[PDB]
Amino acid sequence: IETINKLNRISRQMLQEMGREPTPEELAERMLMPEDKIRKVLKIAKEPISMETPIGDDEDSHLGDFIEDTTLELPLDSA
Amino acid sequence: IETPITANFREGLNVLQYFISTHGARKGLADTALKTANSGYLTRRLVDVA
Amino acid sequence: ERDGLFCARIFGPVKDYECLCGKYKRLKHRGVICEKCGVEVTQTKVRRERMGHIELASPTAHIWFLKSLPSRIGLLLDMPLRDIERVLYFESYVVIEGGMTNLERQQILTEEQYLDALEEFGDEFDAKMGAEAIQALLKSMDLEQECEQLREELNETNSETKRKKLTKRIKLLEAFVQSGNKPEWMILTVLPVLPPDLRPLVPLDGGRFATSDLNDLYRRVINRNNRLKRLLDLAAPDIIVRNEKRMLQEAVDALLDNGRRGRAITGSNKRPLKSLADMIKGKQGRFRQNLLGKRVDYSGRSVITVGPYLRLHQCGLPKKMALELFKPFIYGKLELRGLATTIKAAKKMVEREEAVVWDILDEVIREHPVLLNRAPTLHRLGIQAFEPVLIEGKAIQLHPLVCAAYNADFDGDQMAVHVPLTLEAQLEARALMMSTNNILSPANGEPIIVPSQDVVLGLYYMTRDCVNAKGEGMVLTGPKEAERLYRSGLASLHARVKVRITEYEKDANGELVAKTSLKDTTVGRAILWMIVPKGLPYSIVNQALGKKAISK
Amino acid sequence: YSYTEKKRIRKDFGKRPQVLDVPYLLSIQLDSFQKFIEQDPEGQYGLEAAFRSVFPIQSYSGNSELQYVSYRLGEPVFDVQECQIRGVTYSAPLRVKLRLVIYEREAPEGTVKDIKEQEVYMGEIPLMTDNGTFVINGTERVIVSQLHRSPGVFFDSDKGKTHSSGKVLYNARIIPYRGSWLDFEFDPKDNLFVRIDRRRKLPATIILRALNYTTEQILDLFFEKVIFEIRDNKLQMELVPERLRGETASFDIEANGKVYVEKGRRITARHIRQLEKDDVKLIEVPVEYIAGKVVAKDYIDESTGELICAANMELSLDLLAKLSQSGHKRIETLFTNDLDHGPYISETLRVDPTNDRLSALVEIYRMMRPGEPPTREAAESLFENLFFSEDRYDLSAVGRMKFNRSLLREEIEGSGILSKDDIIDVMKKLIDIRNGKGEVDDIDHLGNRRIRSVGEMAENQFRVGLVRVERAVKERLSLGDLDTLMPQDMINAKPISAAVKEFFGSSQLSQFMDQNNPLSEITHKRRISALGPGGLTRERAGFEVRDVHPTHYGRVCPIETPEGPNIGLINSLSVYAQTNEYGFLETPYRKVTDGVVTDEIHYLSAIEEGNYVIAQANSNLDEEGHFVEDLVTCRSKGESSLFSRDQVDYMDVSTQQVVSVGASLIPFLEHDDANRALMGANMQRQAVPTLRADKPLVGTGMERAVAVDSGVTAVAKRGGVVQYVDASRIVIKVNEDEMYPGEAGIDIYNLTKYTRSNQNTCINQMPCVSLGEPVERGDVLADGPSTDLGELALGQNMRVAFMPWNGYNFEDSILVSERVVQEDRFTTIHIQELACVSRDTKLGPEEITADIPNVGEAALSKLDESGIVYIGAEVTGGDILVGKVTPKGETQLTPEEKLLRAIFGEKASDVKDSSLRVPNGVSGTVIDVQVFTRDGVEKDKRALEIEEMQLKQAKKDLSEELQILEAGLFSRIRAVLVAGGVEAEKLDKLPRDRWLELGLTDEEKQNQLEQLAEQYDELKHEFEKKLEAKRRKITQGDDLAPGVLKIVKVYLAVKRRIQPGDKMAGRHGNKGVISKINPIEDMPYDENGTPVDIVLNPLGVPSRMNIGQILETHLGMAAKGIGDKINAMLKQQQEVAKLREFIQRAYDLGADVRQKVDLSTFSDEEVMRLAENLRKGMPIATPVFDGAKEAEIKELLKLGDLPTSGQIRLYDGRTGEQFERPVTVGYMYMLKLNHLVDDKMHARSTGSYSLVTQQPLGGKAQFGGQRFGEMEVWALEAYGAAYTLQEMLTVKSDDVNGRTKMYKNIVDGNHQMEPGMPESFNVLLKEIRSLGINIELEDE
Helix, strand or coil: CHHHHHHHHHHHHHHHHHCCCCCHHHHHHHHCCCHHHHHHHHHHCCCCECCCCCCCCCCCCCCCCCCCCCCCCCHHHHC | CCCCCCCCCCCCCCHHHHHHHHHHHHHHHHHHHHHHHHHHHHHHHHHHHC | CCCCCCCHHHHCCCCCCCCCCCCCCCCCCCCCCCCCCCCCCCCHHHHHHCCEEEEEEEEEECHHHHCCCCCHHHHHHCCCHHHHHHHHCCCCEEEEEECCCCCCCCEEECHHHHHHHHCCCCCCEEEECCHHHHHHHHHHCCHHHHHHHHHHHHHHCCCHHHHHHHHHHHHHHHHHHHHCCCHHHHEEEEEEECCCCCCCCEECCCCCEECCHHHHHHHHHHHHHHHHHHHHHCCCCHHHHHHHHHHHHHHHHHHHCCCCCCCCCCCCCCCCCCCHHHHHHCCCCCHHHHHCCEEECCEEEEECCCCCCCCCCCEEEEHHHHHHHCHHHHHHHHHHHCCCCCHHHHHHHHHCCCHHHHHHHHHHCCCCCEEEEECCCCCHHHEEEECEEEECCCCCCCCHHHHHHHCCCCCCCEEEEECCCCHHHHHHHHHCCECCCCCECCCCCCECCCCCCHHHHHHHHHCCCCCCCCCCCCEECCHHHHHHHHHCCCCCCCCCEEEEEEEEEECCCCCEEEEEEEEEECHHHHHHHHHCCCCCCCCCCCCCCCHHHHHC | CCHHHHHCCCEECCCCCCCCCCCCCCHHHHHHHHHHHCCCCCCCCCHHHHHHHHCCECCCCCCEEEEEEEEEECCCCCCHHHHHHHCCCCEEEEEEEEEEEECCCCCCCCCCCEEEEEEEEEEEEECCCCCCCEEECCEEEECCCEEEECCEEEEEECCCCCCCCCCCCEEEEEECCCCCCEEEEEECCCEEEEEECCCCEEECCHHHHHCCCCHHHHHHHHCCCEEEECCCCCCEECCCCCCCCCCECCCCCCCCCCCCCCCCCECCHHHHHHHHHCCCCCEECCHHHHCCCEECCCEECCCCCCEEECCCCECCHHHHHHHHHHCCCEEEECCCCCCCCCCHHHHHHHHCCCCCHHHHHHHHHHHHCCCCCCCHHHHHHHHHHHCCCCCCCCCCHHHHHHHHHHCCCCCCCCCCCCCCCHHHHHHHHHHHHHHCCCCCCCCCCCCCEEEECHHHHHHHHHHHHHHHHHHHHHHHHCCCCCCCCCCCCCCCCHHHHHHHHHHHHHCCCCEECCCCCHHHHHHHHCEEECCCCCCCCCCCCCCCCCCCCHHHCCCEECCCCCCHHHCCCEEEECCCCEECCCCCEEEECEEEECCEECCCCCEECHHHHCCCCEECCCCCCCCCCCCCCCCEEEEECCEEEEECCCCCCEECCCCCCCCCHHHHCCCCCCCCCHHHHHHHHHHHHCCCCCCCCCCCCEECCCHHHHHHHCCCCCECCCCEEEEEECCCEEEEEECCCCCCCCCCCEEEEECCCCCCCCCCCCCCCCECCCCCCCCCCCCECECCCCCECCECCCCEEEEEEECCCCCCCCCCCEEECCHHHHCCCCCCCEEECCEEEECCCCCCCCECCCCCCCCCHHHHCCECCCCCECCCCEECCCCEEECCEEECCCCCCCHHHHHHHHHHCCCCCCEEECCEECCCCCCEEECCCEEEECCCCCCCCCHHHHHHHHHHHCCCHHHHHHHHHHHHHHHHHHHHHHHHCCCCCCCCCCCHHHCCCCCCCCCHHHHHHHHHHHHHHHHHHHHHHHHHHHHHHHHHCCCCCCCCCEEEECCEEECCCCCCCCCEECCCCCCCCEEEECCCCCCCECCCCCECCEEECCCCCHHHCCCCHHHHHHHHHHHHHHHHHHHHHHCCCCCHHHHHHHHHHHHCCCCCCCCCCCCCCCCHHHHHHHHHHHCCCCCEECCCCCCCCHHHHHHHHHHCCCCCCCCECCECCCCCCECCCCEEEEEEEEEECCCCHHHHCEEECCCCECCCCCCECCCCCCCCCEEECHHHHHHHHHCCCCHHHHHHHCCCCCCHHHHHHHHHHHHCCCCCCCCCCCHHHHHHHHHHHHCCCCCCCCCC
């Protein structure tokens, strides 16, 4: 959490000085850390999406049935 | 309405009569579109009863 | 985690017969508890039919037991809803049981009154806060004595409102006694946990995670329970303990019925979470979405087509519908004759669309039922069964005469196609829901075929008359002569021509009576009588054939 | 007359002259977008008003402040094409000038401590293109015209349906722009109740007492005072003679004379005027009349000192005796006797228990936030900040204007907050309306509702972002240092940009632009939606709101709105309507001065329309004079009547001012029903372009304006000589009159071919201008996807006959022929996107390898070394497109598979097969592939090919411009050398680049040559800089999603020819479907040359109360006859003068024509081109609500050598017999929606299922099962069937064991069911157990 906060505080100054989204290369050069750590932090730092989010503009069908069940096998392979 | 329409669809109509009949046509359309759901609710109730 | 929500030790393995650390391979090992992770090697469906529990520190009052009308808790305790609400939310104290003659059961005291009454007496004034007090009251109360008191009071007075109240209370008490339930079971000390499969946590295709609101609710409940335990283990002050208990009660409420007595808990972005009460009561709940009607295998939706191209009890279907639905039967009858090596090769042969595939599909579709549906299905005629025939063009054809049965005009609607698999269902669809067997409407004894079709208007025109123009002034022997005269291009179907009509009438026992005579009519009416079989009289067709006429 | 009109002339049957100017269709959009952004220091629009209302900001300490100076709009980073291809949000940076001024704590006004200034970046703002698209995340989203009520005060009445006795109650609501509304309602107990945000009902006097008002002041402001005098024996009053209206006299009125009014008779008007003429001053009234009234002020006691009787007290005998003994002989009593007034405030004071302002504030604080002890300071601060705050409570300048107009004020400008007198005036007006003086305001009136456009929505979002960022600044400034901290590190650009992105990507108004045809884009941008945040919802909408109000004349199109649940909620803005600076719709009219119609135009709103009279456009214009008929029909106050000449106030411009384009494009609108016209407008706006766009024969006169304002065609901003024409790039030389001396007079236009949208179709720009044809400003050099030459070609013109058949025209269907499919008519092009993404797993990185196991040469012959299909390959559904492999770890296998592997001995490496395949039933061709990777991953020798291809495609227009500029510079150098010396033969032989090395005499020519060389060097440097900038943009345009290595998009193009199963309709609304495709032989045919192509159904046509298609068919037959005559005259070379005379006689057939055809001034080549264009039939046009009568149709039929009846017999293509009655045949213009049977048809047997219920999914993209609702279940229950129901329910939805057993039995030939237990039932049981309920398998 502290590393994410430091990276965000650095990205805040980077965007204020440049005006564009902070590239991972410049962030890693300024942080003196490899790009793999920055990439992993940017990948993991994402809020999970809710399960009742509507797919469209109309609140008719939610995200209840929108994911396929790829865990169990199918009748084809069983047969 | 006190003043009715005198022409018909064969000789053509003006803007006034068309605009005065459109608000009744769409009124009936909205009425039947909203009652198509009350009818379904009534069918649901009648199926649940018997 | 080894102590998380969906831990592998409590709810079983995640994968198919595989431990947590991936050490217990060789599925043969069944029911062996590991020493490192401790995961019972079983199937994945074990998580579906098992649940957990949470050990709470302080008991909680069930929200939906007193918030639901007519507040059965208040009826059994003879106390209004406002009082039990003030007691549960730690606003005022209540006396459980008073041994002295000062106060008795069901007496409310505020913060100042409780302090004034506590400094005077001691060791006998029993009073707790909310859930504990209600549990002690339900444990110390006696049902038989209260029932006897109510039955003795009802015999003396007969005030309508009070009599009905006491009668409902006696009914509730008798039901509770005969049900074998205990009053201590009303409180909640250990609440169950939803199975992990009902609250899934799988990564989305967009590289992100999809969480569940119920997981967040359970996490909040567990966090509040841990905070309450840490406060009780460290001797927290009275105000902090009351606030933590109120928060735990609110969390239990939101987990059971999220936000109906007050403000709902704010969700992820803007919308509040839905609880089990919303999954049970709401219109998008499980009842009217997964029990009554839901998605069904071996189905399809297609566009309508305008053309008979068949007979009454037959409909036209595109090659693909059976291209995707009859493939199990295709593979079965391929293994029957042995034209394919295995099922895996038969699938590829079907995917190549060979000629033998269609030759076998022609026999698969030979005398096979299929259910047609139009949404919505109001009356019985909305669900019928037919038999399909392979055609070109990927739109399903519909029978012309079932347009009034399905109540679906040919304006570009969508039809649903379903396929029965079992011989039982196939036979009950062939016999019961056939267009030939089900021809009348369930509303009245009249035929449901009340048709459109200016085509039928032209039939009526055939049954009409016209001027005496060229073609009138002859006599014909039978309807076939009139048919030939009209097809050869000699006269119209309006000529007043006497036809030698041989009419048949039923006998008194069931036989037929033959009689031939001349009838003044036209050519079109003679053709219509020819279309009529030898089982109907001629006096009905002798007039104009409109809508009500053909209906009769 | 422009050249686009000279190519082909549309015969306009206009009866009334067109004197107005056709306004721009997408005008409100660009106007709002400019008003939100354009710099205006004196105008409070957009960012200016935002920074003026927010800044300067005051903190708690009040020592440091942040002031605003100005803002600067940035330059576009990437082009619109690059933003559409890559997917970057087209926007511009924002820099706001902010000054930090720190005061001193010692000095009172010492501001010399710290004064700094700096530009701060607050985020990006999405710009707008010429069309009006919002490029967000590579998608063209649009926000469109939210509808809501204007801020102010609205008085309404309750029309029953919720009462106890049935009394007409009233209410008044205050609608603010930001804050909480106030509702003053009338209780059925004759009491005025106040509600704040619909929380609790308070008396009406607590709000007045909270504003430091006593009882006597309220009684003086609301009620009137009457003076009663007493001299020891009497009760005299100063009775006004005009106040006795409706009062029963209970005594004898004697005022210095005889008995005036008898005891028992009521006061009449004659008695009123008599007593007024008598000059009555004092009347001795009895004691019974005075005893029972209400006092006004408090009369203190001069003897004791206490209050004998306070205000609002009923009079009695003892009270009057005490007042007489004390000495108060001037009693001020209120006047409440009849319906003229009402003692409702007295009852409110009696009910209200509060005494002073403190108790009122305490009660308000307890109502606002209960459960909290009330304190004086906090309650006062809350009451001052809720309503008396400028930054919190302020509606609008338009809001203040509406408030002043409702209160009948004189000034239309005021403060932003409410004063202590505004509420009093509102209450007075409300009680006057209750008494029966005012009128109940209507909600459907357009003067009470308004429209919020793109500018207002963006301003609200910017206000929210600025409030959040100023809260952040107040949080960060009260703790940080005032010296070492800079203003650039305090303000964070994340909240504002996040709010902007959320609004532009996930709001209800932000919808995907329907890019089927330009008409859809026009009718979507010119739409007005009442659904979304701020207005009513889909459920809240009832019947009283969706009805069309008579005030909607010429403002809102009533025949263009989607059906279903959104009927009468999302409408279409009319053509001539316009949004003024206040947000109200207005329509331009014409002044009528004593019957003389001048050219003066005045825009009127709904309130201004309801006051004057409007004459319809059907009045005859007497060659710029007065009216012809004495009694002209006009409309006013919602009623139509015959008025004289002097009673006419305004005149409409034309008849097409009410109906918008999307619904007025119908050739015959007055011959159709309202529902029929609505359905036709929907079918037309949802149409799909064809392969070869052909102009419609029958049309309107405003199609040119729509085609030129759609923005999809080539807009000629300057006009000139076209030099180079190509299928993708067109250059044009600007004339010397418009050529600027600074820049070059050559314009280049790149034709966008096959543009991708969210409604995938064939979007291209086909060029039309030839080599050597000049154009002017406002022309069309290249058409679009659904635009013909100067017209908007939606569908296709085909032959149509109204006749029955053997069942192919059963119920309003469409039967077509084979020539329609053979000639590629009604043929579209679909573009399906297919994206293959490469993501690394937790156990292995992701790689792309063409070598895929279990794949032969058949699938690898069309793949490159990297695994990408060659550009230009035709693929069929089932082939692999992108070769992607995934590393797999050690996977356990069953002993059977292990034995099989040991037998075969193959390697069988653990590599997953997750390659992209083509969906089944999709056989098309790939146009171009796109590979997008990040900066870390190398292009891997694959993207280099497409990069070099794009670079070769580029550097074309830039190179041509550079060569042209260099040639011009060399020509200038040659001219200078000729003017200086004789150089004619020593310049062409020498190279062009060696002209700067020649040294002439030391004079001015040497300096000119040096300046020209410096200019050439500057041009070369500019070209190099442009190339470097292009390369830098290409390099930096490598943005990729996190955790994604590569993305390969295919964009597979499919022909998808016409086949039975597609919905087709027209402009009147003859919706149907393609029944079958019969050959041209089995179709009916005419006598000589025209076989029938389309056969319609005459069953549902006469029942839907609309002639429509009949008149359209007759006019199309006339046009086709004229075209056949023109073609027959053109096939011969008799004489061009004869062709000119025939064209002139054909165009001059109309008796009363609007536009006179000028043909004598044209050349021979122009007439030849006109004839070649009209070979396909001349386009006949007609205005809206003004169509040619049947006489003109018969005359036009007789002109083209056709029968006047318009009904010709046909011959059957099957038997060859002649029909009894003739057939109505002719040309029509048919359209078709998307409605593709390839996409609508979707069936599945087995596949993917759900997670919680294991049930199939729903949708085409989902590829799942179909829904089986409760209606079919009830239908099966009504039947005797029991096995079908359970088979569909339990063993096909959730039970895995049952369905797999049934599958195993079917694949083995058993047909056994073996039912089990539904998994959904187990889920329900567990859900019930989760609540604490015991349900444990109750057995027998």
